[PDB]
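To illustrate the input format used throughout this study, we show a single complete record. The first block contains the structure-token representation of the backbone; no residue identities are included at this stage. The design step must infer an amino acid for every position from geometry alone.
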């Protein structure tokens, strides 16, 4: 008969129970299938995870094994078996050679799981034989029943599509949190204050005595230590650089002509410029940049008897110094000029007034960063690609394998976010001045006008006129990673798609992109098309769109997420809310007045607890290029992935050499620090 040496490698996850026994039915390339063997698996203790189990077997010969089927075979206290991969060694009677068939899995068996052999196969391929072709249709059909487009009324309007799930637990086990502690990370109760050693500040609504006391929030519980911001935040040079190398580099842009509603006169800023330069000359030469937060106009701030918060709709003007530092030179708190809305300037205003003006500009930026730059443009805008993958692509498809490690965990975290971050009562609601409902409205307002053109990094930075800035470290690093990721995606795609026709006739990728265009990214209530293709007509379109996804799920998220402690650690560097309205007159600002506007003690601790949670990196995390749970079997794919890792290693080396001798190096896009996906 036919001998089969089946080796099962258990993954790093471990469910509850003992009897993890299952049955395995092999299936040959030509349809010849065997009988359900019985794999006995028993877990000694609860902690143990991983390991190998080898089984010798005998049954009907099938030839080349194209796929395997797994079914729960446990009797008492059945435990869901999380399997990394299966290796079946046999011999082809045709030429009596020992051949191994690797089956990359990384799934919980639960009920019944079918796993293809490593080789990736397009539906319009020649290797898509009958047995494969019939299975992949069933797989996708089954998945569509588990992964539907959500209709939660809270989030159906002016937002990207999302998965249908009431809670993280109501999701399929395969896309749940890989750590149970995660589900309870954004709760900010007394115990969370206590974890940071700050429970004595819980419920304390007093002002901070002075600006330096915010350093009290950095206890040994905060392992990153005291942010450099604590030492530099007052410096105009540091201030300017926070709009480039902080957590939100999406707003500032070259200004060739002032908005009519921002009447900055040369007299106000002339001595801040270079000798021999006027405001007009500076603009002609492209030395003037601006941060306009018009989008905050109309967004309501929290207004309750016991909690009132404020925000403005400011404009900031910056100057590109001769040594490549940008500095703030003018600020207007509200869009429309008026008697109570003057232009602030370090040349014409007091030092305390200037500090106040800067704090209000950063506060506006915080609103933008949290809701638009982070949550919307990373978390929510990327989720649709994960949902569409499950609904339209079989696990044998090369694109499914490509995106899998990068979309991992996004559905889980977003489902939690929809309950504990975004809604009223959530984290954002507790720390942002636009909390109380406005945080969602701000996202909706950006979405109504968003298109995927704003995701083309190269062209976005270019049309903003900021891609030439020497000390814009995010830009330099992001552009290296973008081009390296684009190369990788292109290599993979050109392995399986020989030409543009290969892309047209791939019915499965066409279902994928069509589902995104229709349900993933609805135009919104302004009818603004999001510029997601109706179909992929060539390989270049396919590569670009996928480059956007991989880059956003890994690099972009990392840059605007894990840098949050350096940015918000010291609250004054980037205020989350204001408890008093802005000043209406000059000369009124001083230390104590400022302390009355800035967050109180309880509020400040809440932010640190949140930021500390958002920057959680588990020891298991896999960083950019590290594909340990690789689904690719083709040796050509491995070559592409290895070249990828080599290109990343070179970027790491560049960033390190540039960061040499710096006090506060930009380190958030070092490949080894960039997770593969959005899992937090
Ligand atoms: O500061 C220049 C720096 O920017 C890079 C991208 O990181 O190139 C950009 O700026 C150049 C001008 O110096 C442009 O020619 C180029 O088109 C733009 O991408 C780096 O090449 C350069 O070191
Ligand atoms: Fe995040």
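Output of the design step:
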């Amino acid at each position: 008969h036919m001998k089969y040496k089946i080796t099962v490698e258990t993954g790093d996850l471990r469910g509850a129970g003992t009897d993890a026994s299952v049955s395995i039915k092999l299936t040959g390339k030509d349809g010849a299938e065997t009988s359900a063997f019985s794999l006995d698996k028993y877990f000694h203790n609860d902690f143990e995870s991983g390991g190998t189990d080898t089984y010798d077997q005998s049954g009907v010969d099938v030839g080349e094994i194209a796929m395997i089927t797994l079914k729960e075979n446990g009797f008492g206290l059945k435990s869901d078996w999380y399997i990394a991969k299966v290796i079946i060694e046999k011999i082809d009677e045709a030429t009596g050679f020992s051949n191994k068939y690797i089956f990359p899995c990384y799934r919980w068996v639960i009920k019944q799981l079918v796993v293809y052999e490593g080789k990736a196969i397009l539906p319009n391929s020649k290797d898509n034989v009958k047995t494969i072709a019939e299975q992949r249709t069933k797989e996708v059909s089954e998945n569509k029943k588990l992964y539907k487009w959500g209709t939660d009324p809270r989030y159906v309007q002016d937002l990207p599509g999302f998965v249908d799930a009431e809670e993280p637990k109501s999701l399929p086990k395969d896309v749940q949190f890989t750590d149970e502690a995660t589900s309870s990370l954004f709760r900010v109760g007394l115990a969370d204050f206590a974890n940071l050693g700050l429970s004595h500040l819980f419920g304390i609504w007093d002002d901070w005595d002075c600006l330096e006391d915010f350093r009290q929030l950095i206890t040994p519980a905060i392992k990153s230590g005291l942010p450099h911001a604590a030492e530099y935040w007052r410096d105009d040079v540091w201030f300017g650089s926070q709009f480039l190398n902080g957590s939100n580099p999406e707003v500032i842009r070259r200004c060739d002509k002032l908005p009519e509603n921002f009447p900055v006169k040369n007299e106000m800023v002339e001595k801040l410029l270079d000798r021999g330069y006027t405001l007009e000359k500076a603009m002609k030469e492209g030395l003037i940049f601006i941060t306009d937060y018009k989008i905050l106009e109309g967004i309501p701030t929290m207004d309750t008897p016991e909690d009132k918060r404020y925000i403005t709709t400011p404009l900031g003007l910056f100057y590109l110094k001769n040594n490549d530092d940008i500095i703030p030179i003018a600020i207007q708190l509200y869009q429309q000029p008026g008697e109570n809305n003057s232009i602030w300037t370090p040349l014409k205003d007091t030092e305390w007034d200037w500090i106040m003006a800067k704090l209000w500009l950063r506060c506006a930026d915080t609103q933008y960063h949290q809701m638009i730059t982070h949550l919307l443009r990373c978390h929510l805008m990327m989720e649709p690609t994960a949902v569409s993958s499950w609904r339209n692509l079989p696990s044998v498809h090369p694109v499914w394998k490509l995106l899998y490690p990068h979309t991992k965990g996004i559905m889980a975290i977003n489902t939690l976010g929809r309950n504990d971050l975004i809604p009223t009562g959530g984290a954002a609601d507790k720390v942002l001045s636009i909390g109380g409902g406005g945080q969602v409205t701000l996202m909706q307002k950006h979405y109504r006008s968003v298109t995927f053109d704003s995701y083309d990094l190269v062209k976005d930075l270019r049309q903003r006129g900021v891609d030439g800035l020497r000390k814009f470290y995010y830009k330099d690093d992001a552009l290296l990673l973008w081009n390296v990721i684009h190369q990788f995606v292109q290599d993979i795609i050109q392995i399986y798609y020989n030409d543009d026709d290969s892309v047209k006739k791939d019915n499965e990728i066409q279902d994928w992109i069509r589902d995104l265009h229709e349900n993933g990214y609805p135009a919104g209530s302004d009818g603004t098309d999001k510029k997601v293709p109706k179909s992929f007509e060539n390989r270049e379109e396919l590569v670009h769109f996928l480059t956007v996804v991989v880059f956003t799920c890994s690099c972009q998220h990392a840059a605007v997420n894990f840098s949050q402690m350096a940015t918000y650690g010291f609250h004054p560097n980037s205020p989350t809310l204001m408890r008093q309205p802005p000043p209406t007159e000059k000369g009124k600002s001083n230390h104590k007045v400022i302390m009355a506007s800035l967050a109180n003690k309880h509020q400040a601790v809440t932010m640190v607890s949140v930021v500390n949670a958002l920057t959680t990196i588990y020891p298991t995390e896999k960083f950019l290029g590290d594909y340990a749970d690789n689904l690719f079997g083709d040796a050509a794919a491995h070559a592409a992935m290895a070249k990828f890792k080599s290109n990343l290693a070179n970027i790491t080396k560049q960033i390190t050499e540039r960061n040499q001798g710096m006090v506060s190096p930009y380190t958030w896009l070092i490949p080894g620090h960039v997770p593969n996906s959005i899992a937090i």
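Structural context for interpreting the output: The pocket of fe (ii) ion (ligand 2) is lined by residues 374, 379, 557, 561, 614, 678, 680 (CB under 6 Å). Residues 1-118 form a domain with the Lipoxygenase-1 fold (CATH 2.60.60.20).
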